[PDB]
Amino acid sequence: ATCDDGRTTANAACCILFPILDDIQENLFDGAQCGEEVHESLRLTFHDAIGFSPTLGGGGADGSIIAFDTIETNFPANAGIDEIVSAQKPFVAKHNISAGDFIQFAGAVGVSNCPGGVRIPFFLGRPDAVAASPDHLVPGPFDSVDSILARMGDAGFSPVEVVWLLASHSIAAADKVDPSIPGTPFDSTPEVFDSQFFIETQLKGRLFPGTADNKGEAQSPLQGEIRLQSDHLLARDPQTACEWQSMVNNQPKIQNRFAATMSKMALLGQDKTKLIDCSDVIPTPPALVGAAHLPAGFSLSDVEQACAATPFPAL
Ligand code: HEM
Ligand SMILES: [Ca+2]
Ligand SMILES: [Ca+2]
Numbered sequence: 001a002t003c004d005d006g007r008t009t010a011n012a013a014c015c016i017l018f019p020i021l022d023d024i025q026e027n028l029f030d031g032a033q034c035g036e037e038v039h040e041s042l043r044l045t046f047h048d049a050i051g052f053s054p055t056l057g058g059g060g061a062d063g064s065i066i067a068f069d070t071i072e073t074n075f076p077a078n079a080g081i082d083e084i085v086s087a088q089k090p091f092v093a094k095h096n097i098s099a100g101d102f103i104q105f106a107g108a109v110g111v112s113n114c115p116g117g118v119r120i121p122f123f124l125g126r127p128d129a130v131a132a133s134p135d136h137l138v139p140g141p142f143d144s145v146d147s148i149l150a151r152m153g154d155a156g157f158s159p160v161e162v163v164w165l166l167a168s169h170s171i172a173a174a175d176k177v178d179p180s181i182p183g184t185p186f187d188s189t190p191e192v193f194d195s196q197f198f199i200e201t202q203l204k205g206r207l208f209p210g211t212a213d214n215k216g217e218a219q220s221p222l223q224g225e226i227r228l229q230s231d232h233l234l235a236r237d238p239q240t241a242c243e244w245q246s247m248v249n250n251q252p253k254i255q256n257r258f259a260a261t262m263s264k265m266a267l268l269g270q271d272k273t274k275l276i277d278c279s280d281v282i283p284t285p286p287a288l289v290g291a292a293h294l295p296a297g298f299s300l301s302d303v304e305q306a307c308a309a310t311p312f313p314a315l
Contacts, residue, residue, distance in 0.1 A: 014124060014278035017105065020095050021281060024109055028091060032283075034117075034191045036183070038110030039172050040084035045107035045266060046168070047072075047081050048100070051133025052155050052268045058133040060155075060269020061126065063099025066092060068132035077138035079176045100126035104266040108282045111262075114171050116193035117285035118255045121263035123275035141177060141216030141228035145237040148230060155268060157261070163234065163243040164257035165265065170197040174226050177217050181210035184226040188295065193285075195254055195292045198247040201227060201235040202303050202312065203295070221302070222295060241306035249292040249313050 002008050003015035025032040028041070044065065051072065052060035065072045066085050073082045088106060092099045101124055108120040137155075139148040152162045170193050175182035187197040205219025209226055218232035235244045247254050294302070294315050305312045 009278065010280055011276050011278065013276045014281055016096065017124065017278055017281045020091070020097065020102075020105065021109060021283075023091060023095070024106055025113075025283075028087065028106060029110060029113060032113050034110075034114035034171065034193075036173070037084070037087070038113055039190070040081075041088070041103075041106045041110045042168055042171065044081065044084050044088070044103055045262070046165070047078055047138055048103045049265045049268045050139075050151075050155055051137050053134055053137055054154065056134040056137070057131060058137065058269070059100075059129050059131060061100055061104055061266050062129035062269050063092075063101075063103055063126065064129035064131065064133050066099040066103065067129045071132040075133075075135055075138065077136075077140045097124070098126050098128050100129060100270075107266070108262075111171075111193065112283040112285045114191065114193040115286040116170075116251065116255070116288040118193075118259040118262075119279060119282040119285065120259050120266065121277070121279045122282055123267065123270070123272055124278045125275040126270055139230065141230040143230060145230075145233050145239060148234070149239060156264070159239050160243045161257075161261045161264070163240050163247065164254075164261045166231070166234070167193070167197065167247065167254045167258045169228075169231060170194055170254075172197075174228070177226060177228065178208075178210040178214045181226065184209050184224065186226065186228070186231065188222065188225060192288070193254075193258075194288060195248050195251060197231075198235070198244055199249075199292065199294060199315070200225060201231045202245065202248070202306070203298065204302055204304050205232070221298075236304065236306045238306075242309055245305075245307045245310065245312060249315060251288060251292075 001012035048065045049061040051058035108122045111117045169186040173185040203221035218227045218229045220227040
């Protein structure tokens with residue numbers, strides 16, 4: 001199909017996304033940058049989608065975190081999410097797509113601004129949410145590995161899919177974990193979607209970048225990085241450590257698995273065969289240019305190797 005402005009897309013119903021793409025890139029992502037607003041919109045896709053429990057309810061990726069923001073932004077695991085919900089709500093009011101479609105579309109358009117990124121498959125047509133998420137369904141950084149794996153498993157993700165989705169923390173920072181140092185990233189390249197997150201969480205912890213006593217925070221290996229306790233333990237736990245190390249210096253696997261598992265997450269609560277594929281509307285991301293590496297001056301002796309089957313790669 002050819003849209004009114006001459007841009008093409010495989011399914012004509014997808015044309016309504018083009019003005020929305022332009023508005024988002026200009027006015028949500030500040031001129032298509034891979035910066036805070038993209039990182040916050042990617043976090044929003046997961047805090048929306050993960051509100052899905054077979055035994056309790058919630059409609060998954062349904063826009064409920066915007067539609068029922070008064071409720072869901074009260075949940076402590078949604079701390080800081082109110083800023084991006086407030087930023088996105090007027091786009092939803094202005095355009096003619098549901099909040100659940102908008103959240104997944106904005107997250108996919110944002111990831112496409114980041115070098116190394118992928119185009120996450122994107123489907124159009126989610127109905128408006130009809131219920132708020134239940135409470136207590138979003139994992140937090142102080143939760144055990146078994147707790148996080150049980151919650152994610154209850155929403156349909158295996159432990160390896162958990163590790164694949166946490167490639168998101170390659171373009172990510174924390175504002176509430178240590179409020180003295182907001183914006184401190186989880187890897188050294190928070191504007192590049194790459195394997196540095198899986199490398200750097202494997203280093204021995206050395207210091208706290210801000211204060212020392214924050215719930216959910218582990219020691220970091222670098223003054224300009226923060227480390228969540230959840231990530232510290234997942235990189236080391238026998239249930240997930242081999243998969244975590246398998247992502248290091250493995251950008252093709254990060255790309256393929258993140259796109260696929262993001263698509264699975266964007267469809268929680270939904271039925272792909274009822275929606276229209278509009279994947280080809282997402283921009284083409286830039287590619288990586290620089291090789292994966294340990295931080296300069298570090299060596300294998302600084303890595304806490306946690307996979308008995310396979311030594312950490314010589315980078
Ligand atoms: C698996 C368990 C997870 C835990 C415990 C966890 C925890 C956290 C925490 C504590 C923050 C910092 C919030 C702040 O203090 O500002 C964060 C940020 C973020 N998380 Fe995760 N997360 C998890 C999974 C995921 C997943 C599956 C995604 C996929 C989209 C995601 C994407 C993000 C992003 C992109 C940010 C950065 C937000 C920003 O820089 O504005 N997280 N996460
Ligand atoms: Ca939801
Ligand atoms: Ca990165």
